[PDB]
């Protein structure tokens, strides 16, 4: 029995919540709080351990971009600090290839990173890899065919509809087909050999449209939209279905959790988080 972990987020200030949803019995677990509150972070799982990467701590008295890597063990219910990244990355994208964590883009105050770095859990070390062709904050990352895809984001001047691809063996980035929609703060994931980009911000509105990349035909195609417009949403795949958690719709911080069935091309409300929040980090273990 695997669970959907939600870490951090934002509601009036950055949050410390770590909670797990069981899609089988519909229950939520309140787990050990993050040591430092964070929003705009990303979550991932390497060998049964959950990792919270980057983000920023917004508080009513000051804000602090994070370069932290923290590790939660479900067996112990304890967060342990890991080696920090070379630079702070708020609105980060994360991907795992061969049990290695790739920290993609993000911001550090005025800087919009195009730099990418890789964590080796076995050595507790980060090393920079080839940078992206474009600076991307609010970037969606997906691992497909042992390639690391950086999808959309914001380069400090424009919200991007562009997407690029990283070849770990070759240490290089190549531009792929751009999305039909400009999206910064989308939920990006892989389901049945397809990259799905759900929600986001086109620079005007928060989106509810969902589109998928088919590698064979190198084309992005729209699928059923979500019931709620959402940017800074959390996303994961669990038992052949996509789950989208919370987000921001232009005025409200959503508690809404939606599920996509690829077989029926329908979205349905599955549960509500214990409280509305945006900019969460999500993973399944
Ligand atoms: C459109 N305005 C922007 O971008 C910058 C302005 C902004 O919204 N700000 C400035 C300091 C606080 C921050 C904020 O309020 N962030 C929170 C937390 O977001 C995140 O983790 C996050 C994570 C990934 C991608 C993008 C985001 C931000 S989503 C935008 C949403 C928002 O529009 N409002 C006004 C509450 N914000 C928030 O949900
Ligand atoms: Cl933010
Ligand atoms: Na490709």
Residue with tokens 């600090």: 81
| Rounded distance between C-alpha atoms, residue 169 and residue 200, angstroms | 31
| Rounded distance between C-alpha atoms, residue 188 and residue 149, angstroms | 10
Token pair belonging to 180: 């039909």
Method: X-ray
- Residues sharing a CB contact under 8 Å with residue 127, sequence separation 6 or more, in sequence order: 117, 118, 120
Atom of ligand 1 nearest to the CA of 247: 39
Whether the CB of 232 sits within 6 Å of ligand 1? yes
Give resolution, Å, one decimal: 2.5
| Rounded distance between C-alpha atoms, residue 130 and residue 148, angstroms | 12
| Rounded distance between C-alpha atoms, residue 136 and residue 262, angstroms | 29
CA distance readout (Å), 226 to 34, 36, 73, 207, 257: 30, 32, 32, 9, 10
Residue nearest ligand 1's atom 11 by CA: 58
What's the CA-to-centroid distance between 54 and ligand 2, angstroms?
A: 11
The secondary structure of residue 274, as a DSSP letter, is S
| Rounded distance between C-alpha atoms, residue 27 and residue 20, angstroms | 8
Candidate of 231, 250, 277, 280 to mutate for ligand 1, largest count of ligand atoms within 8 Å of Cβ: 231
Candidate of 279, 281, 282 to mutate for ligand 1, largest count of ligand atoms within 8 Å of Cβ: 279
What's the CA-to-centroid distance between 56 and ligand 2, angstroms?
A: 7
Whether the CB of 276 sits within 6 Å of ligand 1? no
114 Ramachandran zone, left/alpha/beta (phi>0; psi -120 to 50) = alpha
| Rounded distance between C-alpha atoms, residue 92 and residue 231, angstroms | 14
Strands of the sheet containing 4-7, edge to edge, are: 28-30, 18-21, 4-7, 281-284
Give the HSE-up count for residue 275: Cα atoms under 13 Å, Cβ half-sphere. 13
| Rounded distance between C-alpha atoms, residue 227 and residue 114, angstroms | 33
Residue with tokens 């994931």: 189
- Residues sharing a CB contact under 8 Å with residue 55, sequence separation 6 or more, in sequence order: 8, 14, 38, 39, 40, 41, 42, 66, 68, 89, 90, 92, 279, 281
Whether the CB of 90 sits within 6 Å of ligand 1? no
| Rounded distance between C-alpha atoms, residue 90 and residue 72, angstroms | 20
| Rounded distance between C-alpha atoms, residue 71 and residue 183, angstroms | 29
**Nearest Cα to 206, choosing from 248, 149, 254?**
248
Residue with tokens 């039909």: 180
| Rounded distance between C-alpha atoms, residue 152 and residue 184, angstroms | 6
CA distance readout (Å), 89 to 53, 59, 282: 8, 17, 17
- By three-state DSSP, how is residue 228 classified? coil
Q: Is the dihedral of CA 70, 172, 137, 98 positive or negative?
A: negative
Ligand nearest to the CA of 232: 1
**What's the CA dihedral at 110, 68, 103, 253 to 10 degrees?**
-70
What's the CA-to-centroid distance between 8 and ligand 1, angstroms?
A: 14
């Amino acid at each position: 029995g695997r669970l959907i972990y939600t870490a951090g987020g934002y509601f009036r200030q950055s949050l410390s919540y770590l909670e797990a949803y069981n899609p089988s019995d519909g229950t939520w677990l309140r787990l050990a709080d993050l040591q430092v509150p964070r929003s705009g972070l990303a979550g991932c799982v390497v060998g049964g351990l959950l990792y919270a990467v980057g983000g920023r701590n917004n508080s009513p008295d000051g804000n602090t971009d994070s370069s932290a890597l923290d590790c939660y063990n479900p067996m112990t219910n304890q967060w342990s600090p890991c080696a920090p990244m070379s630079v702070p990355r708020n609105r980060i994208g994360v991907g795992v290839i061969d049990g290695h964590i790739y920290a993609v883009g993000g911001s550090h105050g005025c800087i919009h990173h195009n730099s990418v770095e890789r964590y080796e859990p076995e050595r507790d070390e980060w090393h920079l890899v080839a940078p992206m062709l474009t600076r991307r904050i609010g970037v969606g990352v997906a691992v497909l065919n042992r390639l690391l895809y950086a999808v959309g984001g914001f380069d400090g001047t424009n919200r991007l509809n562009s997407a690029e691809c990283y070849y770990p063996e070759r240490n290089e980035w190549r531009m792929i087909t751009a999305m039909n929609t400009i999206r910064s703060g989308a939920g990006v994931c892989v389901l049945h050999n397809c990259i799905y980009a759900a929600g986001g911000y086109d620079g005007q509105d928060q989106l509810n449209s969902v589109e998928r990349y088919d590698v064979a035909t190198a084309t992005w195609t729209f699928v059923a939209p979500m019931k709620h417009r959402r940017s800074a949403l959390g996303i994961t795949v669990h038992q052949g279905r996509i789950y989208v958690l919370g987000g921001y719709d232009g005025h409200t911080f959503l508690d809404s959790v939606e599920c996509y069935d690829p077989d029926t091309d329908t979205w349905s409300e599955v549960t509500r988080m214990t409280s509305g929040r945006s900019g969460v980090g999500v993973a399944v273990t």
